[PDB]
Design a protein around this ligand. Sequence first.
Ligand SMILES: [Co+2]
Ligand SMILES: [Co+2]
Ligand SMILES: [Co+2]
Ligand SMILES: [Co+2]
Ligand SMILES: [Co+2]
Length: 581
Amino acid sequence: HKSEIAHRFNDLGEKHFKGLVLVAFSQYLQQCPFEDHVKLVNEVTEFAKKCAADESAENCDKSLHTLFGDKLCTVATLRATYGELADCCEKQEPERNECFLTHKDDHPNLPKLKPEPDAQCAAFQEDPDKFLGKYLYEVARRHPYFYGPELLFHAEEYKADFTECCPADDKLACLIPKLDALKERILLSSAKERLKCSSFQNFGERAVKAWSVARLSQKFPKADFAEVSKIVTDLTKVHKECCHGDLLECADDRADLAKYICEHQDSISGKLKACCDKPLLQKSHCIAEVKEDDLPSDLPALAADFAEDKEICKHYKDAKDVFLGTFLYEYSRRHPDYSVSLLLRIAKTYEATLEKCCAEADPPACYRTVFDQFTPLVEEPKSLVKKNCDLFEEVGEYDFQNALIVRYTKKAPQVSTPTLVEIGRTLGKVGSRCCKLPESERLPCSENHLALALNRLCVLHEKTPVSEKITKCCTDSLAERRPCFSALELDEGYVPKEFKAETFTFHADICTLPEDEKQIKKQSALAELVKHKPKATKEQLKTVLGNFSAFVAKCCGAEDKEACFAEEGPKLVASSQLALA
Ligand SMILES: [Co+2]
Ligand SMILES: [Co+2]
Ligand SMILES: [Co+2]
Ligand SMILES: [Co+2]
Ligand SMILES: [Co+2]
């Protein structure tokens, strides 16, 4: 007590306190070795215990920021590895931490993490703490904005894959499909929490609260506006702190909110009963990803209050954030069939139909049909989702991914080929995740997951800005980002890329690659086709990539793969310019 450091240490416990302070330090210094962070973890941790014992020991009075920040300025070769971070060390808090966050790196391009079941199981055995703590470090620097408490959860069950399939008979066919499943849920968690951190950075806490109201209202329609307002206030603080690097306060404020949600579960949702009977970290996760509660029979008509009342302009002018807050709570809770972005688009439209109407002579007759200005906003997303699932169901993940790589390469021919491939592929996964779902939960799954995919494209675009069309879609409006991108067409001020034969030249190296890595090189080539002939129809490119695949399939199954690529490759590179006029 009387010390911020000692206090968390006490409540969170050493294991987690360390766990979070390692993740925190990994995210900030992505370049440093694993053992250089352990000693910063152990030096800080030592200080927590020393402060815990004696709360008037030197500098124990200082803030987490000053402590974590002072410890980030004592590391080896900070100027050599991170010349940018050195300058941050000159400034004091909070100026320093903001500077620190500035130089976080969203695409550091480190080796992809490979399941190596021989060694990893062996390292887990000599030191389990080390092998698992090394997994915290690894994902923490590849995802500088991951949800630290949610990582400790992913790191407690990465261990429960090695408690199962380390002593077992088959060391890969027990382990790989679970470490490959962990990875697809890592990539999803990171995306969700990058979109929360991105929302603060570009749009603010008003935007993150509005999103939360919509989402939580949909999940907890039984809860009243005071419960939702409270959980949103609390959940927002949890995310603001996690995104700014206060992973200690983030883990305590999140556990307090779990404690609360669970104490009040009968008033909030009947779905929570399952989540609240579980251990600490399992509780927070089960709540974060919980099924939506059944729509309540006693849901009120909104016509009366939001369209029919004659003193709405008074309600609205007297306190707007509140009245609009209430609207969003009410419309969201009765529309779980809707996407968060769509609900916020509708809230933004409801708002604009009062700002205008309340200046006209008779407002009530102006906003009486406000609700039928929502129908058009609902049709558009529902079309695209049916348009995209009808194509997906017909041609599969690969051909759908290929179709989207052409769509987005035409809208943004200046974005790099890896970025276009990753986004097209990330978007292609959407069809796999949402189209098979009950069509009831199809529009929400599709749009909410397009929001994660587009947000990454924006994160990358901040780092490496190439296109003014992509800037406007990423920065103007959070609600309208997907509609903004959907609306983009081919940039006709684009100069088609000077044809380089080496780009469309394949060799036998590709025949060794796993299926996934083989597609990326083919999809990489597709993007480069669209760049060279932007006007080429999607039907021309699908045919020319077909000719490329056939060509790869054949030569990979030749006695002389090397000679086959040598003879056929050039013939195909030349015939493809003429197929794409
Ligand atoms: Co406490
Ligand atoms: Co900020
Ligand atoms: Co702070
Ligand atoms: Co309705
Ligand atoms: Co990349």
